[PDB]
Amino acid sequence: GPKFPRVKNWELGSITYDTLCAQSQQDGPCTPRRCLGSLVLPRPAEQLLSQARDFINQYYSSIKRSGSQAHEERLQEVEAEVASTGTYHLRESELVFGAKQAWRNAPRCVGRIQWGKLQVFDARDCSSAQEMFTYICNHIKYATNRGNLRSAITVFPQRAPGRGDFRIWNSQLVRYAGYRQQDGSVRGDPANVEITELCIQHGWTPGNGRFDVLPLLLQAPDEAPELFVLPPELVLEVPLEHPTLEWFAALGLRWYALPAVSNMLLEIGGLEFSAAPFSGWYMSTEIGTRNLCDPHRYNILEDVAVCMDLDTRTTSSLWKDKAAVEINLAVLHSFQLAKVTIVDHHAATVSFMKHLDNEQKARGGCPADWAWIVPPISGSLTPVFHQEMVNYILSPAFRYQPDPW
Amino acid sequence: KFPRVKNWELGSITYDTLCAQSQQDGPCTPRRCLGSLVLPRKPAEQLLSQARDFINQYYSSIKRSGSQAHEERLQEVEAEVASTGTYHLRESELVFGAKQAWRNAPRCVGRIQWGKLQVFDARDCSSAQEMFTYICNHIKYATNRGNLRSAITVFPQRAPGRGDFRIWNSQLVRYAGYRQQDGSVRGDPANVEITELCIQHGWTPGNGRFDVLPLLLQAPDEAPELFVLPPELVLEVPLEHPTLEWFAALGLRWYALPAVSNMLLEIGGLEFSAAPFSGWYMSTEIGTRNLCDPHRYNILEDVAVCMDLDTRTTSSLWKDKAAVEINLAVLHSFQLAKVTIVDHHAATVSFMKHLDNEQKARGGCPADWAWIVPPISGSLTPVFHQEMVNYILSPAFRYQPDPW
Ligand code: HEM
Ligand code: HEM
Ligand SMILES: Clc1cccc(CCCNCCc2ccnc(-n3ccnc3)n2)c1
Ligand SMILES: Clc1cccc(CCCNCCc2ccnc(-n3ccnc3)n2)c1
Ligand SMILES: C[C@H](O)[C@H](O)[C@H]1CNc2nc(N)[nH]c(=O)c2N1
Ligand SMILES: C[C@H](O)[C@H](O)[C@H]1CNc2nc(N)[nH]c(=O)c2N1
Ligand SMILES: [Zn+2]
Helix, strand or coil: CCCCCEEEECCCCCEEECCHHHHCCECCCCECCEECCCCCCCCCHHHHHHHHHHHHHHHHHHCCCCCCHHHHHHHHHHHHHHHHHCCCCCCHHHHHHHHHHHHHCCCCCCCHHHCCCCEEEECCCCCCHHHHHHHHHHHHHHHHHHHCCCCEEEECCCCCCCCCCCEECCCECCCECEEECCCCCEEECHHHHHHHHHHHHCCCCCCCCCCCECCEEEECCCCCCEEECCCHHHCCEEECCCCCCCCHHHHCCEEECCCEECCCEEEECCEEECCCCEECCEEHHHHHHHHHHCCCCCCCHHHHHHHCCCCCCCHHHCHHHHHHHHHHHHHHHHHHHCCCCEECHHHHHHHHHHHHHHHHHHHCCCCCCHHHHCCCCCHHHCHHHHECCCECECCCEEECCCCCC | CCCEEEECCCCCEEECCHHHHCCECCCCECCEECCCCCCCCCCHHHHHHHHHHHHHHHHHHCCCCCCHHHHHHHHHHHHHHHHHCCCCCCHHHHHHHHHHHHHCCCCCCCHHHCCCCEEEECCCCCCHHHHHHHHHHHHHHHHHHHCCCCEEEECCCCCCCCCCCEECCCECCCECEEECCCCCEEECHHHHHHHHHHHHCCCCCCCCCCCECCEEEECCCCCCEEECCCHHHCCEEECCCCCCHHHHHHCCEEECCCEECCCEEEECCEEECCCCEECCCEHHHHHHHHHHCCCCCCCHHHHHHHCCCCCCCHHHCHHHHHHHHHHHHHHHHHHHCCCCCECHHHHHHHHHHHHHHHHHHHCCCECCHHHHCCCCCHHHCHHHHECCEECECCCEEECCCCCC
16 A cells, blocks of 8 residues: 555564655665665765754654754754854764664664664764774773673764874774785684784784784874784683583684674764774674684684584585584573673574564664575574565664775 | 676676666665565566567577578567567477576576476466366476476466466465464465365365365366376475484475476566476475474474473574474485485585576576575575675566466
């Protein structure tokens, strides 16, 4: 009946319509002629003002004062600030709402049931790389909380016309080094070969382990990036063991507690925060399947399968599926043992389904990227697999940005 | 302009130029992507242009573009449409069209095989009885005592003003689903409705979990007729496990032949509303979707308890462990019974080879990532890390409404 995408759950037979997508102001990559929904990265005061107006309207709606005196005054205040300076600034409570809405709007994040509980740290007074380091350490301490992890984001000053950006060069606050070898192989995390070489070029004395924590490369405006080593006591790690396979511990595997993305751009009302690291807690498949089993990452599948004595000479033995399972179980078991927050892919997807129902009621839909929401193992075993999803771009948003080098 | 397609495991990049040949809109728009949706939301000049396009494809396929045989066939088609509002395919054109529709099917992981397809012309069918004979031959040919062979049987095309030839069943072989008094379902819950239709049309129902359904076949503007498949035609594989001796005691089994019977085959503007096709199973279809889906046979918990796994919590990964052993049982049992089957690793590996072949042959390949990526162990397969472009090429298989 209604002129909006009809969305179906095939497990439960239930139907919803997404009216929220009508609020989207920015185009995705798809056209009627072809769907590009599987691509990871698909390709002026007038413009700013309309984005600023839209966001201020969003903010005043959220506090139930849409159409009010203070609403129209804030609108006038922003237009006049853009009139004289070419940009404008957010009130603290506007920044908090916007950071939360950006998370809420993130189609690829399965953790969004938690969106209303996000600690927003204002670091818009930051004026140096040393000061960025302090704020980042504070974020890591607060968010790690000795294993009882808390969602947090730290927001550094916005892009300024003329002036250069605040940037964190690392893709995460915690990452393991990747050292290219003579034979052409990589020791450590192959994902991190480039940032590792950048750190060395900038004066880091490199290790030679599989799990060396990288230093931070931090760039304050119009300045070369400075190098900062995180003090080991701040970086909580978890040695990996298996509940029943006693040899698993002898593999010497481990992972860090805090998943903190540090290279994404936070956009709010046309303002761009080029440095705004955020952190949650892991879903176990991120570590157990992607980081540890991706062929282009640590690639430990064959190693674990040989220890399990599987027939790795034939696909039909399902040796890959078997090893992958035990590795995920190991990640789950070790984090629980160490009392570090983690969520398995079953409980995560169940909570996301609950989130979808909340947002259906609250907003008339929820933008979601099926390929990213569905876990990388046991897909159809989780409820989200059977849930159709509409994907679109809402603002405030987190967006990829080019590497600063 | 043209999509840039990256494989994130290998760092390799292709560009899809084939998508520019799409003449049919999918569900997406720049404002929102609807790629995860299973189904679509919903004259002479048009038909003639779809026809010329297809005849052009055919003659190009046999390296005779521009030949007088090409020119003459274009005029036959034009003369026939201009006089009758429609036209008919030559058998060779039909054979080519069916192979191309399979080739162009974005959701099929089995397309490496697309050039090897037995095509039965059943367009001289005038009754449900005759459809049944054709279907039985298809099943015999395709099953081949467990050495499965891909096949399609093509029944008469749609015609203006008259009803369609239709097979009412969604597959040639399906197990019955009997709604019990207490709201549960004995058998396959996916087939409750088709089971009820069969009973209403005179079928005497069984009461098992794996009762093979009769076929409801419909000749134009006639009530469907009921036909029981001779039990010797329907090859089945009892499921057992290589190391778990108790597994056979579950009484599980599945049929050898995966044959879709409710899709529409469109070629050159002509529509074939009954054109059942079959290949062979990819193991996860049976082991994961058919047996483990919560709204199907849903055996996960049962298997987990036999394995004495901790069912109380999600974090023991009991579901993941049980699912793996079930898929293993399927592979072992089909291999023991000498029935053709492909595991999801072998399948996805051959699909990558197909993507490469198609890049060289056509400059691209329409693929639906959500469907190509297996339902367990996704990122453990190469297709997970492969960007894909989805679009509709013709000849095509399409969904169509239920005839009831
Ligand atoms: C609280 C627990 C959280 C969980 C369990 C969680 C889970 C996830 C997962 C599994 C992904 C997929 C990432 C990948 O596969 O590369 C993801 C992506 C993402 N998350 Fe979260 N997340 C959480 C918190 C947060 C927070 C606090 C934010 C921001 C305020 C956030 C924003 C995002 C964004 C923007 C992406 C997309 C990143 C990309 O496209 O590369 N998440 N999340
Ligand atoms: C020969 C071995 C074959 C294999 C291994 C194979 C594999 C698959 C699989 C796994 C699917 C997804 C089905 C689902 O999960 O619902 C699929 C879909 C499909 N296949 Fe095949 N297939 C084979 C042969 C064929 C043949 C012979 C045809 C037609 C001539 C064909 C046409 C299609 C079409 C049109 C779909 C989409 C079905 C839908 O949208 O419901 N396949 N295939
Ligand atoms: Cl090489 C490349 C190019 C484009 C996108 C890509 C995705 C990787 C980044 N995606 C986020 C991964 C990640 C890591 C730690 N933590 C989170 N995280 C934290 C809270 N929520 C998600 N997410 C890679
Ligand atoms: Cl319930 C619902 C409504 C609309 C579409 C849907 C798709 C399911 C069927 N998709 C094909 C399943 C299937 C079964 C047997 N065999 C094959 N098969 C054979 C060769 N290739 C695929 N495919 C379900
Ligand atoms: C090619 C494909 O889009 C790519 O491998 C995607 C698929 N889904 C994903 N899903 C999540 N959560 N994270 C990822 O990195 C990816 N990668
Ligand atoms: C909603 C979602 O698109 C739907 O459940 C899809 C996902 N991928 C699939 N993939 C295959 N092979 N078969 C399916 O039925 C589905 N179902
Ligand atoms: Zn799309």
